Design a protein around this ligand. Sequence first.
Ligand SMILES: O=c1[nH]c(=O)c2nn[nH]c2[nH]1
Ligand SMILES: O=c1[nH]c(=O)c2nn[nH]c2[nH]1
Ligand SMILES: O=c1[nH]c(=O)c2nn[nH]c2[nH]1
Ligand SMILES: O=c1[nH]c(=O)c2nn[nH]c2[nH]1
Ligand code: NA
Ligand code: NA
Ligand code: NA
Ligand code: NA
Ligand SMILES: [Xe]
Ligand SMILES: [Xe]
Ligand SMILES: [Xe]
Ligand SMILES: [Xe]
Lengths: 295, 295, 295, 295
Amino acid sequence: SAVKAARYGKDNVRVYKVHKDEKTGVQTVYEMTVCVLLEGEIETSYTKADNSVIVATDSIKNTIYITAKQNPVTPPELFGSILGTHFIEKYNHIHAAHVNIVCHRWTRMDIDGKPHPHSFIRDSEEKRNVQVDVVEGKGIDIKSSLSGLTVLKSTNSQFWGFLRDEYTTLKETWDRILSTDVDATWQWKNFSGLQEVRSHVPKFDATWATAREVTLKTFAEDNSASVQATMYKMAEQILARQQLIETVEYSLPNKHYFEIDLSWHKGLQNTGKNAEVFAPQSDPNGLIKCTVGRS
Amino acid sequence: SAVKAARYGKDNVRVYKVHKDEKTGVQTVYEMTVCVLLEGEIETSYTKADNSVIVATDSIKNTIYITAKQNPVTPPELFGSILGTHFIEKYNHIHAAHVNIVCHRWTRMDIDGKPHPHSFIRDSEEKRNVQVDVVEGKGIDIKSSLSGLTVLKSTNSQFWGFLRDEYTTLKETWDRILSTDVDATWQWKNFSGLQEVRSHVPKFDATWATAREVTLKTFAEDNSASVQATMYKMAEQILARQQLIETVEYSLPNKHYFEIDLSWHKGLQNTGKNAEVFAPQSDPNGLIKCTVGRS
Amino acid sequence: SAVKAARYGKDNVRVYKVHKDEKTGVQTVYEMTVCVLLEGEIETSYTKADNSVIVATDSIKNTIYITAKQNPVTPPELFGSILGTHFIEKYNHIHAAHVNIVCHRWTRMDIDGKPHPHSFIRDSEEKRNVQVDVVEGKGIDIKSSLSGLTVLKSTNSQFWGFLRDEYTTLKETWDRILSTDVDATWQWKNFSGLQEVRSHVPKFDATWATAREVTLKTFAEDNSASVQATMYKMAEQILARQQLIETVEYSLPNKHYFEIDLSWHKGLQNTGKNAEVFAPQSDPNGLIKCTVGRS
Amino acid sequence: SAVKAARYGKDNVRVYKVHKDEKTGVQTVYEMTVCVLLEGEIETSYTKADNSVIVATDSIKNTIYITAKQNPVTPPELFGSILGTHFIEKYNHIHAAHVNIVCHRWTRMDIDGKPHPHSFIRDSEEKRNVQVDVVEGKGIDIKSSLSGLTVLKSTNSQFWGFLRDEYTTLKETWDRILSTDVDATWQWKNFSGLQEVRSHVPKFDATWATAREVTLKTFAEDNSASVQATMYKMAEQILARQQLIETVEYSLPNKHYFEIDLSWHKGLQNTGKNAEVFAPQSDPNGLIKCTVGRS
Ligand SMILES: O=c1[nH]c(=O)c2nn[nH]c2[nH]1
Ligand SMILES: O=c1[nH]c(=O)c2nn[nH]c2[nH]1
Ligand SMILES: O=c1[nH]c(=O)c2nn[nH]c2[nH]1
Ligand SMILES: O=c1[nH]c(=O)c2nn[nH]c2[nH]1
Ligand code: NA
Ligand code: NA
Ligand code: NA
Ligand code: NA
Ligand SMILES: [Xe]
Ligand SMILES: [Xe]
Ligand SMILES: [Xe]
Ligand SMILES: [Xe]
């Protein structure tokens, strides 16, 4: 037997950082969960019990805190690149670092119509994520994402003209509820190293904001022919607005809301044009994916 | 042996309702999860296998949908009272109905600075809840709540002057992070029946909004001496603003963020006035409760 | 305004303890999650910011560890009573302690048909719980429970003869699937204090085992007329076998498995006597409760 | 822009099947959650709103039920292969099916030392999974796994001799607790189609049982030098026992239990050889992966 692949590290490292402006008194908080996995010349720890090649996962945890202390933690694409680069430069036998970061929302509170200097609310479980792969001699690959954005529209969704055969019971419809949890990932062109990532720093927050805006607007405005058709429109627009993105991937559950026929009870009309009360279905759900790239 | 207490019903009934304004084209959605448990002269179903006394839980589910079809579902205090009253009036041998409702957020989307007519976002897992107990000959008892409101302030919290003995290691502090998930419940004076609940309908949404506003403002502005002292201030203000509330209960976890001493590494200073990077603790947590009523 | 009720403490305190037999080499592990809430003369911490009355929740956490170090942690009824008694005896102004303990399963592994001395498996998320209320001058009230015991029988359950009216669609049945998650609680007669709890120590594990055995056997063997009728039989038997129990409470979800009519597809027969493939329903669910006591 | 990759289907389809032996009266139940995603010539549904290429996800759900009705559902490797093959053979323009199956435990109850004919218990949340990729003209690729197997040993784990630098605080140890949740995957050699999968049917259950046995035994008996070294031993043995497996992958969290220094309290000794009470840590955790293949 032989080791074909190996990676190891620390998962679920929760980190909070506060920035205090001494002038204005304004404080800004960041909270993240971080995972760092390393690869390199470490096969002997598995095969020969040679621990001398292991940077202890506890040390990886320490490194995340120290790096957060000495560097900006925003945008997460930059923090992840700094963190990954550290391990490949510091340890001769480590040749790749894989850094995943989940950013949690702490939104400044508005009290009496003015922004509060040091009080925050978690408005939704929506996350902003990054995956950063730093590979010695191959640069830095960054995938940025938003996840956990849950939306619903109550009309202006249709689904008709699909394949009908002996397995089909679904009725065609020209007016349905559409609801989904959005997972959208944009993959950056490969960067040569930290200097290049630093040179593009302003684009990271701007592209996240654009991806979010395009997703929300397209969903709200498209008279949707299917989840497939609407999601493609979103991806197309993101690629048009940021030339440094190579691909856009969406993964979308179709969370079904079923009509309830109440006609058995006193002829009550609750279907088609008369539908008012629906039953949300926890499962099963449609799952629709697509990756869109450039011609 | 004897049956001392018994209740039975249907839990986790998910309900969505849409309202369509034919004039403006504006649609508004409501989504809830409902539980209804009944009590009454049903002991024989347990002791003698006499199913003739059982209103099937499947029928309870049907009733929730039918009631939602024929009545407003907002405010939830009114819907719960209608639903509970139905069972005690319809079935001679049922003498109490217990209705719990969890309302999920569907917030209208703003697209290009204007409210969209039929598109919604789930902004946070904060819930608005009601518990309604309808007891034949004893009226309607309603407890209203908000839950899952998660907040953090990065300064203006202190904790000193607590009891110190041989079990104590905690250091006194004049500047700490305070973060909690707010669960706040206000209990209404007993109502004689549906007519009286209907007469107070405008107060339900207004009091929920007030409870939310008072909680957020007090948390943000109080230079907190403890969770205990800050929560009391919140409860006091709610009781002052709505005379029809008899008691206010808060249950608050104290979600700890620990300093990380980094001085072992190159004398790095990250404690006290120099603290920037903290470790959020998933567990354990403080849990602080209080029920405040009128003199 | 006035404080009507107040309690505070530490939740989610995870504790592991190991016992090492120096003779046999056998090790036995216990793992629990503990919550301790205190009550007493503490109103001033809420109303006057008087922290001098507060035993810090951090100290409560320390106390749980120290108490686990110096005392047996099994049976949990005894550990909870020791822990609760500590606070009311140690602090003059604390008059009640409420201790909740969840015991997690670590079952000794059998390797090659023999019990391993120091290796364990988590066989199921079933828990054994206790709630202990220690109230100065009123003794010790203990509720013991099992929860998270998930069972299913594929036949020998019926449900017919229930009330039928204009809200009813459910068909009567003489053969259905019955599946539930068992939550069963037995409440002990009040104990005068620790000496009395200590005198009954052997009964705690034995009664837990009996409650478990009676639940499983009755479920498997009863040709069930309803959840109500089967659960009553369980409770009756537990009360008969342990005279020191005053009441038995069961809370049981009815987790539905629906037939799937496939007759639309090539006349395929999958209902009634021909039913083979079913759709488990995540929600809604029936919820059936009963508390049984002595004549 | 262009579609680079696309797949779509139905997730979270819960399925139960019962087998009734008319002779013995014995019933056996199977419960699974199934996901099926399809790929093929479907780009136009995304780019041109051409729904004529879409097999509706609702039809995919119907197909899973019908296939379960007409075929054995065990072993899951066979069921998944039947299900995947159906879609690529039935629909000309569908060229790949990806089938994931999670099998839930329903273990026959022993009542009074004998196996009950129709009553079952969920003993643990351990799952048996399969991933089956059926690709037109490329055969059937099957990955089998077990997950959610949670174990702990209280001694006979060590960790010393790791890299020490200015980021390191971890002390070397010769006696620690080791606890993990096991995720183990074995990848079968590619099969040419259903006939070949059918010919190997007896190997699937046997190899699952062997993988489980080897994991448990090795964990219990190895005087572990690290998670890395112990996991390699497991993988090596599985590859030796089943020649039709090409690779074995393990992914193992290292769930930490920390010593608690109690010496501040009356000189209480609870560290090193005196350690009895530990604090389980919910996060962070080590994460250790390896893929082992043949020379
Ligand atoms: O078994 C271990 N492997 C590791 O890589 C490690 N790092 N810290 N502790 C550890 N334990
Ligand atoms: O056992 C049952 N009890 C009930 O109360 C009920 N209601 N619907 N189905 C049911 N099954
Ligand atoms: O606000 C607080 N209240 C308390 O009771 C407490 N105990 N430890 N820390 C604390 N903080
Ligand atoms: O938008 C949809 N896409 C699909 O593929 C599908 N299948 N059933 N319903 C559906 N709705
Ligand atoms: Na390197
Ligand atoms: Na009545
Ligand atoms: Na006392
Ligand atoms: Na095909
Ligand atoms: Xe952070
Ligand atoms: Xe609703
Ligand atoms: Xe414990
Ligand atoms: Xe199944």
